[PDB]
Symmetry: D3
Subunit: 233 residues, 6 copies
């Protein structure tokens, strides 16, 4: 496809979608066997391998609705991908949500215009595939993770002049901010395929708490495992 | 409160919210014991009774975001209600959704402006309380119902000059149209309480299929049972 | 129709539209002769009777644009109703508007999206039928009522986190808040029929002044009389 | 003021507001005595004179919301003007509205953003002053004119790539298109003063019928007379 | 055309577009030879003459997007005009922009809805014709003027209840406020013709600094010269 | 900064901003001397080197407004970057714009909501820094490139269900589609720094014409040279 140089059939029907292509590489190296790298266009690494005997892929998406939308469109339309699980990070809005929690997004709010353009006059609420959601939730619960299922904000702007609205969203139960889910969920719905976002809380927007990769790496691995565990079902 | 003449403490912390006050009466009469009617302001009947030993209420909401918003605000703010389960009907958008299916709304799309006014520039995705959702889903699954968990449209207009957008939403996986969930979910989130909408598909918008109360009454009863079963947990 | 169980011809061409179905019952019992109740679907009572020799109906609408829109659409499209006069209550915004004043809405502002969806990019100003307006105004003037003809706000939300905009509207001459007129006026215009809203100021939003039915019942009756007097012309 | 070079007190409290400054000149010359021209800034002629013994002014506004808004703001804020009657032309949308009809605008729809900016999330319906409206209506009725009281469209664009929405508005009873009323009515309301627009139908948008000044001059004069007759009351 | 009484061929292909028709007259009298006045409809004077041997016209536009849109549409569509240079005034937003500076608008921001209506969901950035822009810039530079090339605000409202947004725009580099450029640039682009706005800073919005015609007349003349110098190329 | 691991001072004040980090690497390797790679967070390579004796950096941005906004914010706020030149690709909308043309964006249209959120009610037109624009234009002209200065569309969605609006924008002179400029220009303006986008037309949206890196590599190099030539001034 335009942004993915894979040959037909090289991408598995189940795919994990980290924002960071280097995390795709990490996931492939850490969890998968019989790995090949099928894409390095724009450095947006994608890999296919085998996990517990099942083929799976992992494809970076970049950050933001427009970037992930490119990849998701191509994966679905050009590569026949059926199950797409974003494995990402997010920033907690509320004190009640803690760093290293895993958030499974039921739905996402957004400041993107993408859905307003598609559905003028409507608020489109992008919805996770419940099957996948339940699988991931059950896997996370069994794995002993702190799993929160709820609402997230898919933001176009990481750096907002005022966080007032973000705070307000937090007061309405929105758990965390991230930059992809609206697009993933909307496009998956458009094409009748199955999507989920499983997120690790990496930072707390208002408390300032931040983490490096390694500082959330055990939790991150466990999260990847549940995203993979859900995927291979 | 302005629209509910109940004394403090007369409304249980768990409440079912049919749109039709006559369905509130039906639910109270059919399922509850030790029933009292605490409201007949505007004919919007509300009852409190006991179900399998647990106090529960049932309160009509009327149709539409503005009507249910009145009642939900009052129930939450004036009567301390904590668990609110709309038990309603809806119109299927897709052929894949069948009359008498039970839909548990994860989230809701809307053509209402209510959330645009609250969150200018954002698409707010109103989210069910996952705990309640899971309880209802599990109860429905155990009850042997066809339960679909997914997205719905909360419509301001029942009678639309064109159903093109509704169809488009259906193509994006939106299961059914109804007229309350956005408000319920948004307000419950605002106030940190727990909401869910459990819906019986009563009609199919495009196929023209329609049902009367009795024609979906067995399924309706089973749905009420799961809404009550979820509530009493 | 879907929400009205009347047989064809049971609903008169002129109809009063209180929000409260119990007020429909009151109006029928108090003012009409040869009354029959043609609807009790959803408790949304509707009656037809005779007033000073002329057949007239009275139909509750429920609260909010979506609710009244259902009934008005059905009345117009399915029952051939030609003259629709909402007889309602409203909350004064300004000190200059007093409890028990009668407001005849020339037009209505709204926070509803209903007209934005119909007329993207436009502000649609829903307009009363001037003939009816003048009749009601003249009748009210002759009846010795305080009648104010002006602008109202048709609100989707009764319970607003901030009344700043409502206050601002008041500063622009908007007299009172209510929850139906935009829809009535817009739909009547759509279908080329005649609508008016005649409102009793029942409360003052900022002063906190409130009234019960009986506390405005003499004025309310006189208002009903002018709505009927206008209707039978 | 910035756009009006009149000294304080030179502008009467009642003013007619044609869009065309040359029509202001015509009105002053034709109807007024003891006339002085108080403004020729930007050629936007303004005059004050006496009509049937009462001082009155006439001030061109130019075309469009932004132009009239300038003048109306200045007239109200800087010159203490209290009664403002636009005397304009308009283009009929419907066949039912005929060239040379006089339209008294109750309210106005618009494609302007002016009110969306002032009242985010709301549709503001600009309303005529009913007193003035009634006076003009009664005067027009007594004068034997075809007077239509209703809704108009205040357009920002005279030349629209598609008239579909304009047609749709016509189907919702909007009588005619013009380019000032929203602003006049909104600003008058803002400042607690009295406004009305009295319009002569000069063209029919869809039929192509057009008129020159002289071809509607007798009707135009009669309209000016009612705007003056209303003003001097 | 509807608003211009010129015969075909009387308007030159290059035209200057002051907002003030009296400035059109000034420009024609001061700079042009062999002048005729081709329009006095609505007092909106238009002239054609010769400048340094080249035919050029000058046409008032009135103030605001709707007014200039009328004239520009007619000039382009009915009179075959190809190069349109607004020669106007503007109010500085920033201290960094000084009275008597000449601003050449690259683009314009707006609070008008005109482009939202044309391009729903999009922000249309109206762009100057670069050729013309460069010509004017080079001419202004050679003339020894302070020329600023940048962004302007095309405002619908001259009199804003709050200048907060205007200030904010100034913080984003918007140089000055005026009331026409969006329309000129958008329409010129629509029709594939060439437009530019060259503005004299006549006032400073926040400092209160104001100028009369004569107080900026030397600079104004030089600006007209560059608009003419650009035009005749 | 959060997404750039550079130490303070490692990033030059002038920076080129390709969307593709691999193009950053190409630019650094091909044009710069004394190169160091200061960032590989998320694979979003950034380099600093020397070009014709002047320090310059090159930093990938990723695709889309949200991605570039992250990097631009960080570059400006955390690294004191002053001159930012996006060097990108774009898709021609019109036949009149040819593959391998270089487009210098004066401004950008967008379907992003980013500016609507910042400037509610306004259309913000993001503007290039004219100085930089002129430098790049002059350099491109001297280099013998086909340089087009004009308007572009900054799209959030690469894959649009309908290109109707894109076509319409093309009819209004918008030259090409890309996915970053609005953000770059807006943020640069916000922070008072200098931005430009210089684009190579790599594809034609409607004709289907596409190019690989090498197929536009000579032109691409020349474009990079002008972006560098402009930068080092
Ligand atoms: N606080 C945050 N705000 C926005 N996005 C975040 C945040 N924390 C993590 N992310 C995620 O990481 C990237 C932004 O750093 C995006 O892909 C986004 O999903
Ligand atoms: N087809 C439908 N469209 C909208 N609302 C529906 C539909 N079917 C059932 N409903 C529900 O019933 C009422 C409208 O008849 C509302 O309360 C709504 O939730
Ligand atoms: N203050 C108020 N705000 C909104 N609606 C009101 C108010 N007072 C009376 N109403 C009317 O009564 C109902 C809400 O109580 C609605 O039908 C509405 O029209
Ligand atoms: N068909 C029309 N469309 C828009 N404005 C019109 C029309 N006919 C008359 N007008 C009025 O005349 C001017 C435009 O020609 C405006 O002031 C407007 O109010
Ligand atoms: N401060 C200002 N605000 C708006 N428009 C201005 C300003 N200064 C000059 N103008 C220009 O002059 C007219 C408004 O006085 C408009 O045509 C506009 O372009
Ligand atoms: N046809 C196109 N549509 C959108 N973006 C494009 C196109 N061609 C090139 N681009 C650019 O390349 C990336 C998308 O492939 C974005 O960074 C964008 O700026």
């Amino acid at each position: 496809s335009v942004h993915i140089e894979a040959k037909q059939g090289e991408i598995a029907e189940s795919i994990l979608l980290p924002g960071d292509p280097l995390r795709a590489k990490y996931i492939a190296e850490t969890f998968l066997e019989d790995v090949t790298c099928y894409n390095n266009v724009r450095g947006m690494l994608g890999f296919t391998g085998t996990y517990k005997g099942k083929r799976v892929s992992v494809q970076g998406t970049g950050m933001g609705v427009p970037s992930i939308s490119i990849y998701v469109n191509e994966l679905i339309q050009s590569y026949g991908v059926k199950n797409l699980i974003r494995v990402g990070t997010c920033g907690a809005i509320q004190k009640d949500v803690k760093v290293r929690d895993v958030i499974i997004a039921m739905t996402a709010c957004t400041d993107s215009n993408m859905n307003r353009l598609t559905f003028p006059g409507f608020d489109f609420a992008p919805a996770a595939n419940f099957d996948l959601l339940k699988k991931a939730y059950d896997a996370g619960t069994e794995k002993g993770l702190h799993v929160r299922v709820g609402n997230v904000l898919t933001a176009d702007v990481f750096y907002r002049e005022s966080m007032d609205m973000v705070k307000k969203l937090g007061d309405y139960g929105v758990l965390a901010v991230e930059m992809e889910t609206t697009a993933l969920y909307t496009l998956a719905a458009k094409y009748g395929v199955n999507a989920l976002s499983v997120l690790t809380v990496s930072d707390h927007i208002f408390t300032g708490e931040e983490t490096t990769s390694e500082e959330r790496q055990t939790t991150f691995n466990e999260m990847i495992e549940i995203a993979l565990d859900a995927a291979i079902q």
